[PDB]
Ligand binder design. Structure first.
Ligand SMILES: Nc1nc2c(ncn2[C@@H]2O[C@H](COP(=O)(O)OP(=O)(O)O)[C@@H](O)[C@H]2O)c(=O)[nH]1
Ligand SMILES: [Mg+2]
Length: 170
């Protein structure tokens, strides 16, 4: 499944794909669903828990948003996970997304937004999320938004296919 997607990137030097988002967005769930290796938790500085899956030359690195700079230098992809059902935190998610995009060291990173929890009845759809995250206003960035249900895995392949293809082409 996902392994073949990411083995496209074999030619690259050691790289990072950062996946961030507010607490409860579904990040840990997605990491587990990838099935690309054990999720290992480290605490590099007091109060800062990082989860990492190392698959071949790729480190999937996950923390909650809402001294990160040393991680950015080899980050090729940025995945931003939003709870599509959490209307009351979408403004906060927009702010955290754009602060991340304001980091000079992430200028060239490819952006994948997972609009997660699409299984939920009252979830905002991907178009609403796009509007509310100000994605249409980005002009230099390569970005894509993908509707997902992390607990079933639905949508993960499609979004990761896009992400890996976009990094690979560089
Ligand atoms: N309904 C629904 N629940 C989800 C989905 N993805 C994750 N969750 C749930 O949301 C909660 C938070 O997930 P978690 O992976 O720990 O979020 P994290 O804080 O971003 O690491 C858990 O109860 C998950 O089962 C989804 O697509 N749909
Ligand atoms: Mg988590």
């Amino acid at each position: 499944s996902f392994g073949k997607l990411f083995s496209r990137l074999f030619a690259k030097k050691e790289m990072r794909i950062l996946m961030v988002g507010l607490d409860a967005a579904g990040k840990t769930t997605i990491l587990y669903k990838l099935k690309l290796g054990e999720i290992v938790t480290t605490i590099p500085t007091i109060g800062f828990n990082v989860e990492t899956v190392e698959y071949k030359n790729i480190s999937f690195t996950v923390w909650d948003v809402g001294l990160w700079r040393h991680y950015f230098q080899n980050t090729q992809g940025l995945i931003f996970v939003v709870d599509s059902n959490d209307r009351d935190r979408v403004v906060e998610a927009r702010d955290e997304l754009h602060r991340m995009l304001n980091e000079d060291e992430l200028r060239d990173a490819v952006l994948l937004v997972f609009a997660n929890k699409q299984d939920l009845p009252n979830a905002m759809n991907a178009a609403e999320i796009t509007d509310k995250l100000g994605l249409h206003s980005l002009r230099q960035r390569h970005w894509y938004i993908q509707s997902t249900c992390a607990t079933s895995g639905e949508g993960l392949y499609e979004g990761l296919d896009w992400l890996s293809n976009n990094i690979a082409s560089k």
